[PDB]
């Protein structure tokens, strides 16, 4: 009280000092039963990669994904993630992962970025502004470059307009740059929109074929199916605990709920995004979550000018649980339960008379002992 | 077994009133005894809905389909752009056993039917990606909502015992989610499938539009009432 | 009504206020304070 | 912040707004208590009506307290407490 | 029999409840960040951008809290005026004849 | 915003300030009307000289 | 453009809030004056004080 | 057409008497039709 | 290059020969001179309200 009041002397009164909150104990992790190696080798160690204008797309789901085995390898020239920190990728669960693979020139790797403009960024591959995921680029001069010239790789050079995000264009039609319509016949101001590459081992950096794969995720759209390699544990009830239900992290006490989830229901909230129910991934049991007790604490003193004894009131908190350590006022000191909360250090009497410092709900305290 | 019909039966294209049908659960979260406002694709209240008593119809953003069917003559659906092997097509069928869902480039003919005595019109099933099997979908009012968003095919369903004579009844019944398919196609048109006997059907079709709704959840978490937001001023 | 701001008219016009004032004046002139 | 050490560390560099907010709210609450106290506590003693009631024919039964109810309220007060929710 | 004769007290209760409700509901806004929950926005990012996101959330919530407090102050002043009038009426028209 | 869609979309994420602003202004207007009506309407009949 | 619009939006929002608060204060003062005027009307016009 | 704007859906009458829903500029509306 | 929305009307305000447009308070361009016909016009917003 002296510390928070900025004085060495306090007069008779009641002052609100601080707050208390029950400290959580242990932790709970719950992940689904399903487990199987996620097929990353096939998309990464693929013998053949599609062209940039025809980038190969794959959807990955129902697997256990480990990303440390990809971070550790230094074979990748560029490893840049956007919405998530890479080191945390092993602690999140997603669903419907998307992988895209293609090959470009050395200097075009900058074009694979949200909010970018150039040749590929608008005519071959377009990324959404708010894209979340990661991009991987590595050198492929030793396999994708040929002495006789590489012509299997073509890029779209001419188009009517820019591409939408995640748009694939494969149509090869003569482009009319001038006013004269080509009418399906190549002529003046008519050019083929697809141009082949000149990949050669003689060429230096900036022209060697580089292999690029992009990974895209979702964020809480459905029951996740792509979890990371984390070991689950058991669950406990009626204890203020930290919980991590399938990536949803929080703190509180868990109770056997009685609200009837429909088979398509996963969790529940009532007002203002307060998740107060959940279904565990393994047992498929409905439980409800409520925060463990917390509240303000105040003191009652007759003025340091007179004495040094004080009383402590915990506001709106049941007397059953109380032990800011202050275990001294938790062993055998007199305890009382009032409508305002719980009072420690004061003696309850049956004498009623006009009173000093008020407390609440018709109860008030004074110094005779307190 | 491809053949074209010569009777050329013409289903009368009548118009009837939507009333207050076509309400579904928008998300998977749970709520109870609360009013929630949501903006999404729905079927506007009191709208014209086309009644057929098998032309190819546009798909648009989404489709509400209803049938006061007797003895489940209606079997399946076809979706696509040109409905030929040139372009990817979607086929859904529901025979006596488990349903079949396929995403392939079939070669349909102009008069598909179940060939009652899975060889209706497709004969050049080429290489394709998605196949799926699950439980059967089917005086019974069967209502479905089909949506195609974000490379996802969402299907909602509901079955009720209908005792009215001809048209849609007055009432309220929310549509629970039925299935989701993670497939990205360019569906623009669709057509129904009938298991015509070989030894004149009634259904209602309506289109969806984006708008805002207010929904009431009772104590059990069941949607029991809704209010359109873009209507007569009192609704607003 | 220039840049998204409006001024609304009052419920009682000036004629009604004048009528109220006239009624009060006539009442106090003729009936003393009894009419209150 | 809601139980976040990083949030509290970032917030503590914004000054002492929260002390002011708490002081304002506490002042409001104390004002409310003093306000009702000065409105209602206009007397010094607790007078009691006599057991026999002959007030010249006037009848005060519906505003005098009713000992039958545990609330020790009158008829009109009970009617009032049931129409404000 | 007749209801709606106590509009003032009901109005006070409704105003207080509505203010508290909107204050709580403001907690779900985005304020330009990538999310509206501390735990998810913390369990996904390298801190150097976490400070940016928490700064956005902090400033938004601070403005909301200040607005609520100011409105409460105004209402409290008005209530105090009303109760002063009530105390005067009780003193004058109950303890004597006016 | 001045009738711009991008401005409206950006503003949408700031919450519900506008509702309470309009609520406060409407309260002020109603109070003004009540003030005038309470001050002047002190009589039940319109007397004539 | 989003950054620029954010700056403009926050500035204009702050200005609007300032205006509303000033209006609230002035309205409270005017209401007090109106109450005094109503009392004077009741006590000095309808009777002798 | 009133000094407060334009009103649609209300039958204007020439009778006059004390009203419940205010509109403005001395005009007000009530429900008998409206 | 100056974009806006409103209703145009034949302005009677006399511009000086070197004048281009006009405004009154707080950057409200209420007049304009078309580059081709060299005609003075006044702009006022089309109707709106609650
Ligand atoms: C692609 O193949 C290479 C083969 O060199 C893989 O790299 C090795 O993977 C094994 C798997 O157990 C590790 O033990 C080695 O340490 C890796 N490096 C070397 C130099 O052998 C690579 O992992 C494969 N790609 C993917 C995505 O799995
Ligand atoms: C403090 O907690 C105890 C136990 O948690 C409460 O006692 C419970 O009271 C309810 C309601 O009467 C009963 O249904 C439970 O059976 C009681 N539990 C036990 C273990 O006795 C107690 O009521 C709480 N304090 C207050 C003031 O409510
Ligand atoms: C979906 O398919 C329709 C047609 O089945 C495509 O619309 C065609 O678009 C091309 C290119 O703009 C036009 O030349 C055709 O005339 C259009 N046909 C019709 C019937 O509209 C549409 O572009 C496709 N959408 C995709 C692939 O996203
Ligand atoms: C009816 O639909 C089923 C889809 O499951 C078709 O496929 C058969 O499904 C049953 C399951 O009950 C399997 O036992 C069969 O092996 C599947 N194949 C065949 C050729 O029967 C089935 O073909 C369809 N038709 C019939 C008459 O059942
Ligand atoms: C399997 O799918 C591939 C992917 O397109 C098809 O390959 C091309 O299909 C078009 C269709 O008209 C042909 O014109 C090309 O000649 C095909 N190219 C190659 C390299 O095959 C292929 O046709 C599909 N297979 C079948 C049986 O339809
Ligand atoms: C909500 O759920 C409750 C509990 O299941 C339903 O109450 C039951 O209703 C059936 C049908 O009349 C009765 O046989 C049970 O005895 C009821 N159980 C109770 C009252 O505990 C209720 O009908 C459901 N619907 C609504 C609108 O409440
Ligand atoms: C004062 O009024 C009360 C009613 O408000 C009278 O109480 C009634 O007495 C009669 C006679 O027995 C009963 O039939 C009624 O039921 C009573 N009313 C109630 C509400 O209990 C009371 O008698 C009156 N005082 C006197 C002295 O007669
Ligand atoms: C998960 O696995 C455990 C043990 O393998 C089993 O007891 C539990 O029922 C499973 N959960 C299911 C099947 O939902
Ligand atoms: C307490 O205060 C009184 C009067 O202020 C004074 O007489 C007394 O000495 C004080 N007690 C101390 C200083 O211990
Ligand atoms: C007097 O107080 C004690 C505890 O403070 C209590 O146990 C006792 O019942 C009280 N006396 C009476 C008569 O209630
Ligand atoms: C439905 O269409 C008919 C004619 O096609 C029309 O008369 C009727 O008003 C329409 N119903 C609506 C628009 O609700
Ligand atoms: C009153 O208004 C009505 C319009 O409803 C009009 O017909 C009538 O001529 C007016 N005058 C009288 C005296 O009724
Ligand atoms: C601008 O050029 C057009 C076309 O030659 C002509 O009609 C017009 O008068 C010119 N404007 C001026 C101000 O000379």
Alpha-carbon span B52 to C5, nearest angstrom = 53
The 10 Å Cβ neighbour count of residue A211 is: 20
Residue D50 C-beta-side C-alpha neighbours within 13 Å: 4
Asked whether A200 and A145 are in contact (CB, 8 A), the reply is yes
Question: Which residues touch A161 (CB under 8 Å, ≥6 apart)?
Answer: none
Question: What is the span of the domain harbouring residue B232?
Answer: 13-236
Q: Which residues contact B188 (CB under 8 A, 6 or more apart)?
A: B58, B59, B80, B81
> Considering only CB atoms, which chain F residues are within 8 Å of C29?
49
From residue D10, alpha-carbon distances to D5, E29, E49, E53, E55 in Å are 9, 20, 13, 11, 8
Q: Is A347 in the pocket of ligand 10 (CB under 6 A)?
A: no
Is A265 in contact with B220 (Cβ distance < 8 A)?
Answer: no
F13/E29 Cβ within 8 A = yes
Q: For residue A211, how far is the Cα from the chain centroid?
A: 29
Which neighbouring-strand residues pair with I8?
I43
Beta strand A226-227 with A63-64 is parallel
Assess if residue B5 is contained within a domain.
no
Best probe of the E interface among F14, F24, F27, by most E CBs < 10 A, is: F14
Ligand 11: centre distance to CA B159 (Å):
28
Residue with tokens 């004579």: B165
Q: Are F47 and C27 in contact (CB under 8 A)?
A: yes
Query: Of the bound ligands, which one is closest to the alpha carbon of residue B33?
Result: 6
Tokens of B1: 């077994």
- Establish if E29 touches chain F: CB-CB under 8 angstroms: yes
Chains B and G touch (3+ CB pairs under 8 A): no
Tell me if B219 is assigned to some domain: yes
The per-residue b/e assignment along A150-179, b for 16 or more CB within 10 angstroms, e otherwise, is beebbbbebbeeebeebeeeeeeebbbeee
E64 reaches F (C-beta below 8 A):
yes
In chain F, whose CA is at the least distance from the CA of G4?
A: F7
State the Cα–Cα distance between residues A35 and A65, nearest whole angstrom: 9
Residues of chain C contacting residue F49, judged by C-beta atoms under 8 Å apart: 26, 29-30
User: Shortest Cα distance from E47 to chain F (angstroms)?
Assistant: 24
D63 min Cα distance to partner chain E (Å): 15
Kindly report the CA angle at G9 between G7 and G15, in degrees rounded to 5?
A: 105
Contact B136, B94 (CB under 8 A): yes
Query: Min CA distance, A52 vs chain D (Å)?
Result: 43
How many other C-beta atoms are found inside a 10 Å radius of the C-beta of residue I29? 14
Answer whether residue B8 is part of any domain. Answer: no
Tell me how crowded residue B38 is: count the other CB atoms within 10 A of its CB. 13
Domain count of the fold of chain B: 1
* Substitution candidate for ligand 10 out of A334, A335, A350, A363 with most atoms within 8 A of CB: A350
Nearest CA in chain H to C12: H26
A234 within ligand 8 shell (Cβ under 6 A): no
Residues of C in contact with I6 (CB under 8 A): none
Residue nearest to atom 26 of ligand 1 (CA): A41
Whether D53 is in the pocket of ligand 7, judged by its Cβ within 6 Å, is no
Residue B3 in any domain: the answer is no
Say whether the D–I interface has 3 or more Cβ pairs within 8 Å: no
- Ligand 9 centroid to Cα of residue A307, in Å, is 10
Cβ of B32 less than 6 Å from ligand 6: no
DSSP helix, strand, coil percent of chain B (3-state; round to 5)? 0, 45, 55
Closest Cα to atom 10, ligand 13: which residue?
I36
Residues for chain I: how many in total?
50
Q: Which of F29, F40, F42 sits opposite C8 (nearest CB)?
A: F29
CB contact under 8 A, G6 and E32: yes
Chain A residues with CB-CB distance to B31 below 8 A: 268-270
User: Counting ligands in written order, which one lies closest to the CA of residue A12?
Assistant: 9
Mark yes or no for CB contact C16/H26 under 8 Å. yes
**What is the H or E stretch that residue G28 is in?**
helix G2-40
Residue D41 CB neighbours (<10 A): 8
Cα–Cα dist E49/A159, whole Å: 38
Query: A346: closest CA among A315, A322, A318, A311?
Result: A311
- The answer, yes or no, to whether any atom of ligand 8 lies below 6 A from the CB of A87, is no
Residues A208 and A142: their CA atoms lie apart, in Å, by 9
B95 contacts B118 by C-beta, under 8 angstroms: yes
Instruction: Please indicate, yes or no, if residue B155 is contained in any of the structural domains.
Output: yes
Alpha-carbon distance D39 to nearest alpha carbon in chain E (angstroms): 5
The DSSP bridge partners found for residue I11 are none
- Name the interface residues of F facing C (CB cutoff 8 Å): 29, 32-33, 36-37, 40-43, 45-49
> For A284, what's the count of Cα atoms within 13 Å in the CB-facing half-sphere?
7
B37 lines ligand 5 (CB under 6 A): no
- Surface-to-core class of residue B44, CB atoms within 10 Å of its CB (0-12 exposed, 13-18 middle, 19+ buried): middle
When scoring A247, A272, A274, A275 by the number of chain E Cβ atoms within 10 A, the one with the most, hence best to mutate, is: A272
Q: Do F14 and G1 touch (CB under 8 A)?
A: no
Q: Are B155 and B62 in contact (CB under 8 A)?
A: no
Ligand (nearest to CA of A320):
2
Is I46 near ligand 13, meaning CB less than 6 Å away? no
Euclidean distance between CA atoms C26 and C19, whole angstroms: 11
A-chain residues near E34 (CB < 8 A)? 83
Closest C-alpha to ligand 11, atom 11: B48
Q: What is the CA radius of gyration of chain H?
A: 9
Helix (H/G/I), strand (E/B), else coil: A276: strand
Counting as contact any 3 or more CB pairs under 8 A, the partners of B are A
Nearest to A172 by CA among A186, B87, B105, B151: A186
Residue at B165 is within a domain:
yes
For the stretch A189-195, contacts whose Cβ atoms lie closer than 8 Å and that sit 24 or more positions apart, written own/partner, are: A191/A157, A191/A158, A192/A158, A193/A156, A193/A157, A193/A158, A193/A159, A194/A53, A194/A154, A194/A155, A194/A156, A194/A157, A195/A154, A195/A155, A195/A157
Would B122 be classed as within a structural domain? yes
Return the structure tokens found at B70: 């007797």
Ligand 7 mutation target, pool D56, D59, D69, most atoms within 8 A of CB: D59
Per the domain annotation, does B61 fall within a domain?
A: yes
Q: Is I28 on the interface with C (CB under 8 A)?
A: yes
DSSP-assigned letter for residue F17: H
Cα separation, A248 vs A225, whole angstroms? 14
The closest-lying atom of ligand 6 relative to the alpha carbon of residue B218 is 27
Give the CATH number of the domain where residue B138 resides.
2.60.120.960
What is the torsion angle, in degrees rounded to the nearest 10, for the CA atoms of residue B31, residue B35, residue B41 and residue B43? 110
Q: Write out the DSSP string of E29-76.
A: --TTSS-S-HHHHHTTS-HHHHHHHHHHHHHHHHHHHHHHHHHHHHHH
Angle F17-40/C14-31 helices, nearest 10 degrees?
30
Beta bridge partners of B91: B78, B102
* Distance from C-alpha of B115 to C-alpha of B12, rounded to nearest angstrom: 25
Could you tell me the distance, in angstroms and rounded to a whole number, from the CA of residue A280 to the centre of ligand 8?
11
**Does I28 sit within 8 Å of C6, measured CB to CB?**
no
Q: How far apart are CA H17 and CA H3, in angstroms?
A: 19
């Amino acid at each position: 009280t002296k510390c928070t009041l900025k004085s060495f002397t306090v007069e008779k009164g009641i002052y609100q000092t601080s707050n208390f909150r029950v400290q959580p104990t242990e932790s709970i992790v719950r992940f689904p039963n399903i487990t199987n190696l996620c097929p990353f080798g096939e998309v990464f160690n693929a013998t053949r990669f599609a062209s940039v204008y025809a980038w190969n797309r794959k959807r990955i789901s129902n697997c256990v994904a480990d990303y440390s085995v990809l971070y550790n390898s230094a074979s990748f020239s560029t490893f840049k993630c956007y919405g998530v920190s890479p080191t945390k990728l092993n602690d999140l669960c997603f669903t419907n992962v998307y992988a895209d693979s293609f090959v470009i020139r050395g200097d075009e790797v900058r074009q694979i970025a949200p909010g970018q403009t150039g040749k590929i960024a608008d005519y071959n591959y377009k990324l959404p502004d708010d894209f979340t995921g990661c991009v991987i680029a590595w050198n492929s001069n030793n396999l994708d470059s040929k002495v006789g010239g590489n012509y299997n790789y073509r890029y779209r050079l001419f188009r009517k307009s820019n591409l939408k995000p995640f748009e694939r264009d494969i149509s090869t039609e003569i482009y009319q740059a001038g006013s004269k319509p080509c009418n399906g016949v190549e002529g003046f101001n008519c050019y083929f929109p697809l141009q082949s590459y000149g990949f050669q081992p003689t060429n230096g950096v900036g022209y060697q074929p580089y292999r690029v794969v992009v990974l895209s995720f979702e964020l809480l759209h459905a029951p996740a199916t792509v979890c990371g390699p984390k070991k689950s544990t058991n669950l406990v009830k009626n204890k203020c605990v930290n919980f991590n239900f399938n990536g949803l992290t929080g703190t509180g006490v868990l109770t056997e709920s009685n609200k009837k989830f429909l088979p398509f229901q996963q969790f529940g909230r009532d007002i203002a995004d307060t998740t107060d129910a959940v279904r565990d991934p393994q047992t498929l049991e409905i439980l409800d979550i409520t925060p463990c007790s917390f509240g303000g604490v105040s003191v009652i003193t007759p003025g340091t000018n007179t004495s040094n004894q004080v009383a402590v009131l915990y506001q709106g908190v049941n007397c059953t649980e109380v032990p800011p350590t202050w275990r001294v006022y938790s062993t055998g000191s007199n305890v009382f339960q009032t409508r305002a909360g719980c009072l420690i250090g004061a003696e309850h009497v049956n004498n009623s008379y006009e009173c000093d410092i008020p407390i609440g709900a018709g109860i008030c305290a004074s110094y005779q002992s307190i | 077994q491809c053949v074209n019909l010569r009777t050329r039966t013409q289903l009368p294209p009548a118009y009837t009133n939507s009333f207050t049908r076509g309400v579904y659960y928008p998300d998977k979260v749970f709520r109870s005894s609360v009013l929630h406002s949501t903006q999404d694709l729905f079927l506007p209240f009191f709208s014209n809905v086309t009644w057929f008593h098998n032309p190819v119809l546009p798909f648009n953003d989404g489709v509400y389909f209803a049938s006061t069917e007797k003895s489940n003559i209606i079997r399946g659906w076809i979706f696509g752009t040109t409905l030929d092997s040139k372009t990817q097509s979607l086929l859904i069928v529901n025979n006596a056993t488990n349903v079949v869902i396929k995403v392939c480039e079939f070669q349909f003919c102009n008069d598909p039917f179940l060939d009652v005595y899975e060889s209706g019109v497709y004969s050049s099933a080429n290489n394709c990606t998605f196949e799926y099997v699950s439980q059967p979908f089917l005086k019974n009012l069967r209502e479905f909502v089909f949506k195609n968003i974000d490379g996802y095919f969402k299907i909602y369903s509901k079955h009720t015992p209908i005792n009215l004579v001809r048209d849609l009844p007055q009432g309220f019944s929310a549509l629970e989610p039925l299935v989701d398919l993670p497939i990205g196609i360019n569906i623009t048109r669709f057509q129904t499938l009938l298991a015509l006997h070989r030894s004149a059907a009634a259904y209602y079709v309506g289109y969806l539009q984006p708008r805002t709704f207010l929904l009431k959840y009772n104590e059990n978490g069941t949607i029991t009432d809704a209010v359109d937001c873009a209507l007569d001023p009192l609704s607003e | 009504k220039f840049n998204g701001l409006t001024v609304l008219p009052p419920l009682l016009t000036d004629e009604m206020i004048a009528q109220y004032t006239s009624a009060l004046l006539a009442g106090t002139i003729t009936s003393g304070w009894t009419f209150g | 912040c809601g139980d976040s050490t990083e949030c509290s560390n970032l917030l503590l560099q914004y000054g002492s707004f929260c002390t002011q907010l708490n002081r304002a709210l506490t002042g409001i609450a104390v004002e409310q208590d003093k306000n009702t106290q000065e409105v209602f506590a206009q007397v010094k003693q607790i007078y009691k009506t006599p057991p026999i009631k002959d007030f010249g024919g006037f009848n005060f039964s519906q505003i005098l307290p009713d000992p039958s109810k545990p609330s020790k309220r009158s008829f009109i007060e009970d009617l009032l407490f049931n129409k404000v929710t | 029999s007749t209801a709606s004769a106590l509009g003032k007290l009901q109005n006070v209760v409704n105003q207080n409840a509505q203010a508290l409700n909107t204050l709580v509901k403001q907690l779900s806004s985005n304020f330009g960040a990538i999310s509206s929950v501390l735990n998810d926005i913390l369990s996904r990012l390298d801190p150097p951008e976490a400070e940016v996101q928490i700064d956005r959330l902090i400033t938004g919530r601070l403005q909301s809290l200040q607005t609520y407090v100011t409105q409460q102050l105004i209402r409290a002043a008005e209530i105090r005026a009303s109760a002063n009038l009530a105390a005067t009426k009780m003193s004058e028209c109950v303890l004597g004849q006016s």
